[PDB]
Paper text:
In eukaryotes, the ring-shaped hetero-hexameric protein, MCM2-7, represents the core of the replicative helicase. The eukaryotic helicase MCM2-7, is loaded by ORC, Cdc6 and Cdt1 as a double-hexamer onto replication origins. The ORC/Cdc6 complex recruits Cdt1/MCM2-7 to form an ORC/Cdc6/Cdt1/MCM2-7 (OCCM) intermediate. Cryo-EM structures have revealed that double-stranded DNA (dsDNA) becomes inserted into the MCM2-7 ring during OCCM formation, which in turn induces partial ring closure.
Numbering used by the authors:
A (entry chain 2): 387 to 442, 449 to 459, 476 to 652, 657 to 706, 737 to 753, 758 to 772
B (entry chain 8): 459 to 472, 480 to 544, 548 to 604
C (entry chain 6): 104 to 199, 259 to 410, 447 to 465, 496 to 601, 604 to 840, 903 to 978
D (entry chain 4): 268 to 469, 492 to 780, 794 to 800
The structure:
């Protein structure tokens, strides 16, 4: 019995994901692993339970297949052939935020990531670029995290207040039906080969900061509780956004963090809210222009206004990242 | 061209002839004040017509106090009518059907309403008479 | 055979074929019930919508009274008569086995509550309105099953299930004696999607010390996935009694089998104004037209809000703009802009702070009153259900009061962990929950109305706003306004304040004479929220110019401000200007509204200290400066003292001075122009 | 007896129609079953005096409501329907016995074991269970107050909330319990329950009350006519403590207190008097808090460190019968109408001092924990006694520096007395002679009977004036209050309401 949940990139914002039960028979077992994207092509059946009528949908699989067309593959080579392909991607990252060109280069590099390779079967060098968003709040810091959840293929948004010790890593919980010690995944477990989004990194407990540092080096979370010794994997780009910003004080005193925590992050973005009359006029005009525009002729006019404000569309940028990652 | 209260004319910034216009403002105490009292009658005459089709389309006979009936009208029309406006609805309906709604005052400031048979055909014919009397 | 049941079914068939509402735009006799059946054939629907007001207008309401009194007894009769009308018109809607059609009644008169649920109303059509807290999944239900025996091999079709797996006791074949062996046929059984929704009381109904009651509402038909947690919906159904299957003295449980869900928070951007204008009475539109035509509507709505508190007109101005809010615009990438305005009440204790918070809760819909003295009670909590066993999500204070104003008291006495979840919902208006394997995002588009206290009792003017309050830096930057109420010991302020308390305690409700009643204010607030003002080209240059002048006062180093001007101060002026234009029913942001919001924002930023009404002196001074300055631009002659009083004689036509009060305003104009002569504002040549 | 009263009231109703000769429907009145609700009897036996011989006897109970349970449906008329000919029947339940029909009543059917019981078409009755707690005024010292189960029927449900003083005067019935849920055996013990008949609070409304005696009202007006009322009541409230005339004059007004002018469109104003005692300890400070609790029927006595922010509000307890999350009242909720005595007010935590800010202003306790955001009402006066840090009020130190109380907490009080322990030879000599006279004779023979009022007469003078006497501020009295408020500031709004 495998419990399949909806993908994080298809769930609409403001709703809760659903999950059903999948039954694997014959040689279909030991195929789907906890942390992969498969295509269950089974029959939608139903079962009657005695407890389902007094307290107040099983899919029998038949074939499992783990996870663009030919016209979209030829268009990627034509766009990337230009000399300004790098500048076009940076300008397309987060089109709802004006300015802040230094922060868009770190988010775009963290989405693609590096090439991990083992060293003669001994060490495993990571490739996920860790970006730590630091600076004064008000510069659309939290708006960048919401953009990755709607563009990346696997992004799990989390926080620092609600997510405790088991909110990020795995846990050993008891099943209320089978009365057995099951294993429930967390934020770092359900985001394998994806992007990790954590909000408010400074307002975190001491028990949760040590579990993150242990997964940023070996890319594995070893949890041995209730006699269940399991060593799960966790390979993702942790993109946090904490809050202190005194310019006279260094980063070790402004941010409430330690030394090994700041050393694991690759790029350290620092935002300084300065006073400039030229930057305030350009920022105020983009806000009003983005709020005015907020049956076939009416739909075509709305799509043309959105493509003019981004200038590369958003639908083409999503498939361009996953094409150069596998 | 329907009712649309949205125009740019509002807040447009920039002898003894106008003094005579201020003398005519004293006549508003019997004209503008009388029109304000008639405006509340328009929001009570047509408002009590649908109220009789709401309470009588439910329970009947059992006694109902003024405090219990006022909280049921506001809760059923909040999607409004205040607590003070709900008391005038039951008071105006007594003059239309005095033989169907019985009002018995209690020594202490309490009114209990009671109805036996509420006919919709009899109230529909009496609603057009009360609406035409206020228009004259 | 039921004699009374057959009479209701015969009258229900004629109601769906003879009733017709005349259209007011075309004037043609169009049948709404006949056209609804034809619309269900294209979209392949199995749920009809019948209004209760149309049933009472036929046969003097004789048919609507028999259904509203005994709904469970006439339930199979109403479904049988509906299938006969569909078969006569479009018979293709029966073949899928016959489809199960359900009737969903909407627009009901009386709307009962949860505390009014009694045993005498079991089996009658009611209407319960509450807030949705917990919801189950989409699971099928065994309605009309088919049992096939193993001996006689007879297919017993049309087997109803009364909330229990009932089996037939006898086989239709007389040559068989089987009373136990029965096999369920899934290919010949009718399944229906049922869902149990646990509702609770409304967020606006906050009585005294009571216990929150819950009701298990069962939805059937097309009502699945229609009651989202956190939104107050209007349910409609019958009160059923579900027994205990695990105990099979028989314990029973009170349930509510609903058939239609009406969302109150939900109800083309131009169609939002025609619905609210048509749902009210004819006299309600006439009362709203005279208010917009009034040139002094911004001054009357301020005095009408909180009449028990005297003075403090600056703090009362932000309450009107907070109830309306801004325009929630969406970007082209999917980001949602915050349109709400958060105001914090900072000042000395015992300054009518509890009166302002209790007035917003007991007036604005969907408002939860809480205090600072937990972390789960504000946002949400993950509590496992004791019946089902799975982990559920429990709504808190920021979820039940959606699209409203959340009043929080004692913000400085909050913990560090409890303040981290508050700042998270003050940016994207969303709450991220990641616990017990549940990774879902819940919206929180509320308005936080804090009321903290300064550290030390009295507000120290020698310190800043950050050092005087026990709050962090990112949380203090979320509020757009900071009304500082200073407890000044004045002889004129304490005299007028003590007179209002004595008059309020003696006359009770007789001393309160507001310009607008409570029912008239609720209709203007909900109507002004549908308006969306658009910034014009002339108003765009005034907002940028006003932002540069305010930022120059903080960079000069002379006036030590209590808070550094950041980027949020620029976006706060846009949200405040939209709320002012909404109160005047204007779809265009005039440049005059920016100057009004700029004065309120400057009064909230108090710098760190290192006979004639004051409201009338500023109005008479602002009008006398622009009039004289216009002479130099136009190129006239001069302006004597006689023409000064004559200038206000034509502009103040709505003063209502008559004859006695008119001469008093003329003498006051001579005293106003006399103070400007002694001061360094105006001058006289001869 | 009640069954006889239900029939005699029916024949008297028909006699009133014939004597009046009215044109009303006589069938609609005779079919209505009238019920009699007797209350306020003479047998006011408590829960501890429930003798076994009082089976099925109407005994009046004077307790307090603890919790509230939802309405439980009770079947009254069963509904049966055949499975072959579909013959609907209606069989009433007699003495809790559902006599199911063995055969069908139809002649064409007549099949044994063919009737189906439909619970969805039965006439259910309202039944509510209310847990009543014993009154602490009748519980002896050294014993814990027990509880009892109540059964409310008819239309009297949803009329008793948690923290309300009612008077249950119903029969004392009993139902047997089963030893097993699957067997038909019964235990030797019988579960006792009181069937509620009438609810008199201490639906419908009380028309009048007949408390105390009219002969005692003549003695009440006799003392009111005397000019020495402010001095006679000040000495009788504490005859064991010498001096402290200015302190006892404030506590006397706290028991009475101003009226509660409730407003419909205005906010609720707190009319209680919050008195805070300060100064050096060992000055008869703890003895005052022990005397007001014995006079007030709903007064409590708590300590500083002994009660945190959970014991004073409402601790989330659990029932030992249903194992459900219940809500029990605290020290500030059980005292709905009395004076709360708190010892060691300066030794409280920071989480407890923040909760009292809302009780001394709006008299409401809003708790939002575990997803339960409810507002509890707590309208009562707070009578505490503060203490300095080093247990010695230094004359060369300010009041805000000697006591660790928050400045906002000091402004919320009404009377901040400072009882100091000054060394005086003329004061210590007279104080020692007064305390020695109380130990020599058990009764004050030197003091006349017209100088010290008993405890029974003092409680009847406060409860009578707080239910009928309502002073109204006139124009002459309101003018002096404004002038006195301006002069005090020339030397907050909380001092004006005090």
């Amino acid at each position: 019995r495998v419990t399949l949940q909806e993908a994080p990139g298809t769930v609409p914002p403001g709703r809760l994901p659903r999950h059903r039960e999948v039954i694997l028979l014959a040689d279909l077992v030991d195929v789907s692993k906890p942390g992969e994207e498969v295509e269950v092509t089974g029959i939608y059946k139903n079962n009657y339970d005695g407890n389902l009528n007094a307290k107040n949908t099983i899919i029998e699989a038949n074939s499992i297949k783990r996870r663009w067309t030919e016209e979209e593959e030829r268009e990627f080579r034509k766009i990337s052939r230009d000399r300004g392909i790098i500048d076009k991607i940076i300008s397309s990252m987060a089109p709802s935020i004006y300015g802040h060109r230094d922060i868009k280069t770190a988010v775009a590099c963290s989405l693609f990531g590096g090439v991990p390779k083992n060293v003669n079967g001994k060490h495993s060098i990571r490739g996920d670029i860790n970006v730590l968003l630091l600076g004064d709040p008000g510069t659309a810091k939290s708006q960048i995290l919401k953009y990755v959840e709607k563009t990346a293929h696997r992004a799990v948004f989390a926080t620092g207040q609600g997510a405790s010790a088991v909110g990020l890593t795995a846990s050993v919980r008891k099943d209320p039906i089978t009365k057995e010690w099951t294993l429930e995944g967390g934020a770092l477990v359900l985001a394998d080969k994806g992007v990790c989004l954590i909000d408010e990194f400074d307002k975190m407990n001491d028990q949760d900061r040590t579990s993150i540092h242990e997964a940023m080096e070996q890319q594995s979370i070893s949890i041995s509780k209730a006699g269940i010794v399991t060593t799960l994997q966790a390979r993702c780009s942790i993109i946090a956004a904490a809050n202190p910003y005194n310019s006279t004080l260094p980063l070790a005193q402004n941010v409430s963090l330690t030394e090994p925590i700041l050393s694991r992050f690759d790029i350290l973005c620092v935002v300084r809210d300065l006073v400039d009359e030229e930057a305030d006029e350009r920022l105020a005009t983009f806000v009003v222009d983005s709020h005015v525009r907020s049956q076939l002729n009416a739909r075509q006019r709305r799509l043309q206004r959105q493509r003019k404000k981004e200038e590369i569309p958003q639908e083409l940028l999503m498939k361009y990242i996953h094409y150069a990652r596998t | 061209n329907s009712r649309y209260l949205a125009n740019s004319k509002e807040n447009f910034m920039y002898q003894a002839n106008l003094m005579d216009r201020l003398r005519e403002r004293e006549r508003r105490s019997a004209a503008l004040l009388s029109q304000r009292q008639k405006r509340y009658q328009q929001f009570l005459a047509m408002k009590m017509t649908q109220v009789f089709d709401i309470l009588f389309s439910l329970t009947r006979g059992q006694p109902y106090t003024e405090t219990y009936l006022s909280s049921l009208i506001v809760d059923s029309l909040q999607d409004p009518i205040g607590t003070k406006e709900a008391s005038e609805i039951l008071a105006g309906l007594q003059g239309i059907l005095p033989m169907d709604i019985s009002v018995h005052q209690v020594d202490g400031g309490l009114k209990v309403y009671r109805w036996n048979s509420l006919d919709k055909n009899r109230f529909s014919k009496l609603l057009q008479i009360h609406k035409s009397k206020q228009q004259d | 055979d039921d004699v009374t049941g057959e009479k209701v079914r015969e009258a229900f068939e004629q109601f769906l074929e003879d009733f017709s509402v005349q259209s007011t735009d075309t004037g043609e006799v169009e049948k709404v019930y006949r056209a609804q059946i034809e619309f269900m054939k294209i979209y392949d629907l199995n749920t009809i919508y019948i209004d209760y007001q149309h049933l009472s207008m036929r046969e003097n309401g004789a048919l609507a009274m028999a259904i509203s009194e005994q709904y469970y007894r006439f339930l199979p009769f109403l479904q049988k008569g509906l299938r006969r009308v569909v078969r006569k018109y479009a018979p293709e809607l029966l073949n899928t086995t016959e489809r199960v059609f359900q009737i969903s009644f909407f627009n009901l008169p009386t709307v009962h509550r949860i505390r009014d649920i009694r045993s005498e109303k079991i089996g009658s059509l009611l209407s319960i309105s509450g807030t949705v807290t917990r919801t189950s999944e989409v699971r099928p239900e065994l309605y009309k099953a088919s049992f096939t025996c193993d001996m006689c091999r007879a297919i017993v079709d049309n087997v109803e299930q009364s909330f229990k797996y009932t089996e037939p006791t006898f086989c239709p074949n007389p040559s068989c004696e089987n009373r136990a062996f029965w096999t369920l046929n899934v290919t010949r059984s009718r399944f229906l999607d049922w869902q149990k929704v646990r509702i609770q009381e409304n967020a606006n109904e906050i009585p005294t010390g009571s216990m929150p009651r819950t009701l298990d509402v069962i939805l059937r038909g097309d009502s699945v996935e229609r009651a989202k947690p956190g939104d107050r919906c209007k349910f409609t159904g019958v009160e059923i009694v579900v027994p205990d299957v695990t105990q099979l003295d028989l314990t029973y449980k009170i349930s509510f089998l609903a058939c239609h869900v009406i969302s109150i928070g939900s109800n083309d951007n131009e169609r939002d104004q025609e619905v609210f204008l048509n749902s009210l009475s004819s006299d309600e539109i006439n009362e709203l037209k005279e208010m917009v035509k009034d040139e002094h509507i911004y001054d009357k709505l301020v005095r009408s809000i909180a009449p028990a508190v005297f003075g403090h007109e600056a703090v009362k101005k932000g309450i009107l703009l907070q109830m309306l809010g801004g325009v929630h615009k969406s970007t082209v990438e999917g980001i949602k802009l915050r349109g709400d305005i958060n105001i914090c009440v900072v000042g000395d204790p015992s300054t009518s702070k509890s009166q302002f918070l209790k007035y917003v809760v007991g007036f604005a819909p969907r408002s939860v009153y809480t205090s600072g003295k937990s972390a789960a009670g504000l946002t949400a909590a993950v509590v496992r259900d004791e019946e089902g066993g799975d982990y559920t999500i429990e709504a808190g204070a920021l979820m039940l009061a959606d699209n409203g104003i959340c009043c929080i008291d004692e913000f400085d006495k909050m913990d560090i962990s409890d303040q981290v979840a508050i700042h998270e919902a003050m940016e994207q208006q969303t709450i991220s929950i990641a616990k017990a394997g549940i990774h879902a995002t819940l919206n929180a588009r509320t308005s936080i109305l804090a009321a903290a206290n300064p550290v030390g009792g009295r507000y120290n003017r020698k310190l800043s706003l950050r050092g005087n309050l026990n709050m962090t830096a990112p949380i203090m930057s979320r509020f757009d306004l900071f009304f500082v109420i200073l407890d000044d010991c004045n002889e004129k302020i304490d005299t007028e304040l003590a007179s209002h308390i004595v008059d309020l305690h003696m006359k009770r409700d007789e001393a309160i004479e507001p310009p607008f009643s409570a029912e008239q204010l609720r209709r203007y607030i909900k109507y002004a929220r549908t308006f969306k003002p658009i910034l014009t080209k002339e108003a765009r240059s005034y907002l940028v110019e006003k932002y540069k002048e305010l930022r120059k006062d903080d960079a000069q180093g002379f006036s030590r401000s209590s808070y550094r001007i950041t980027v949020r101060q620029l976006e706060s002026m846009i949200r405040l200007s939209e709320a002012i234009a909404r109160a005047n029913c204007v779809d265009e942001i005039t440049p005059s509204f920016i100057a009004e919001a700029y004065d309120l924002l400057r009064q909230s930023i108090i710098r760190v200290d290192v006979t004639v009404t004051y409201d009338k002196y500023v109005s008479m001074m602002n009008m006398i400066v622009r009039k004289i300055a216009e002479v130099d631009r136009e190129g006239a002659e001069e302006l004597t003292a006689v023409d000064i009083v004559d200038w206000y004689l034509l502009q103040k036509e709505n003063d209502l001075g008559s004859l006695a009060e008119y001469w008093e305003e003329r003498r006051l104009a001579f005293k106003v122009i006399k103070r400007l002569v002694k001061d360094r504002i105006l001058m006289e040549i001869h | 007896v009640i069954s006889i009263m239900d029939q005699t009231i029916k024949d008297c109703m028909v006699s009133l129609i014939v004597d009046n000769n009215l044109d009303y429907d006589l069938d609609e009145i005779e079919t209505k079953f009238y019920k009699v609700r007797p209350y306020n009897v003479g047998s006011c036996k408590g829960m501890r005096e429930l003798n076994p011989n009082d089976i099925d006897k109407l005994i009046n109970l004077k307790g307090l409501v603890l919790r509230s349970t939802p309405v439980i449906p009770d079947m009254k008329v069963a509904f049966f329907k055949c499975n072959v000919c579909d013959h609907t029947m209606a069989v009433e339940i007699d003495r809790g016995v559902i006599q199911e029909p063995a055969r069908c009543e139809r002649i064409d059917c007549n099949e044994p074991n063919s009737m189906s019981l439909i619970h969805n078409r039965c006439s259910f009755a309202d039944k509510q269970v209310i847990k009543l707690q014993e009154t602490p005024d009748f519980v002896p010292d050294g014993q814990t107050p027990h509880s009892i189960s109540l059964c409310v029927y008819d239309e009297l449900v949803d009329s008793c909330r948690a923290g309300d003083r009612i008077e249950v005067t119903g029969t004392f019935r009993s139902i047997p319990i089963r030893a097993n849920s699957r067997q038909r055996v019964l235990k030797s013990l019988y579960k006792t329950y009181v069937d509620v008949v009438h609810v008199k609070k201490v639906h419908n409304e009380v028309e009048e009350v007949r408390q105390i005696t009219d002969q005692d009202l003549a003695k009440i007006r006799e003392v009111a006519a005397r000019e020495d009322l402010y001095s006679l009541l000040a000495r009788s409230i504490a005859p064991s403590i010498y001096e402290l005339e200015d302190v006892k004059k404030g506590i006397l007004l706290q028991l009475f207190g101003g009226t509660n002018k409730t407003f419909t469109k205005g906010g609720r104003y707190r009319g209680d008097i919050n008195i805070l005692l300060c100064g050096d300890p060992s000055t008869s400070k703890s003895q005052i808090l022990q005397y007001v609790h014995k006079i007030t029927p709903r007064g409590v006595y708590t300590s500083g460190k002994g009660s945190s922010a959970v014991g004073l509000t409402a601790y989330i307890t659990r029932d030992v019968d249903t194992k459900q999350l219940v809500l029990e009242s605290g020290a500030l909720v059980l005292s709905d109408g009395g004076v709360c005595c708190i010892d060691e007010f300066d030794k409280m935590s920071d989480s407890t001092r923040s909760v009292l800010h809302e009780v001394m202003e709006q008299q409401t306790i809003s708790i939002a924990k575990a997803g339960i955001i409810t507002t509890l009402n707590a309208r009562s006066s707070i009578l505490a006694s503060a203490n300095p840090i080093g247990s010695r009020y230094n004359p060369n130190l300010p009041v805000t520096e000697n006591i660790d109380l928050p400045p906002p907490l000091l402004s919320r009080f009404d009377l901040v007395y400072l009882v100091l322990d000054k060394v005086d030879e003329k004061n210590d000599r007279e104080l020692a002679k007064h305390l020695t006279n109380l130990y020599l004779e058990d009764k004050p023979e030197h003091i006349s009977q017209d100088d010290v009022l008993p405890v029974e007469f003092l409680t009847m003078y406060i409860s009578y004036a707080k239910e009928h006497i309502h002073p109204i501020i006139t124009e002459a009295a309101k003018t002096e209050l404004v002038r006195a408020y301006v002069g005090m500031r020339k030397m907050t709004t909380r001092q004006l309401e005090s």
